Amino acid sequence: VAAFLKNVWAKEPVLVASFAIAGLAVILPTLSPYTKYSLMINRATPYNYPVPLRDDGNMPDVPSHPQDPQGPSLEWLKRL
């Protein structure tokens, strides 16, 4: 079968270039750790408005001042 990938590429190298780009396209999102950053960037882009909550017992975290060390880690993008 190892000649079939070289004795049709002497006759029609047209669709062979298509399968070579059809392949190596489905394969790569299962490979590089650059993906799931593509979902991590896409999650912390605020469209709507952040409504606040109310104190009742808890008090889990995040007081009235926003610039306190209160919220989660989305500040790795400015270092990126």
Partner 1 sequence: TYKYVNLREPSMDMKSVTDRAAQTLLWTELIRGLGMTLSYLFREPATINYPFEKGPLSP
Ligand X SMILES: CCCCCCCCCCCCCCCCCC(=O)OC[C@H](COP(=O)([O-])OCC[N+](C)(C)C)OC(=O)CCCCCCCCCCCCCCCCC
Binding interface with partner 1 (CB under 8 A): 6, 9-10, 13-14, 17
Q: From the list partner 1, ligand X, none, pick the one residue 8 interacts with, judged by a Cβ distance below 5 to 8 Å according to partner type.
A: ligand X
CA-CA distance, 71 to 63, in Å (whole number)? 10
For the segment 17-36, give every residue that binds ligand X (CB under 6 A).
18-20, 22-23
CB of 10 to ligand X, least distance (A): 11
| 6 φ/ψ sector (left φ>0, alpha ψ -120 to 50, else beta) | alpha
Q: Which is nearer to ligand X, 8 or 41 (CB)?
A: 8
Whether 15 and 21 have beta carbons less than 8 Å apart is answered as no
Distance from chain centroid for Cα 50: 23
| Interface pick for ligand X out of 2, 3, 10, 14 (rule CB under 6 A) | 14
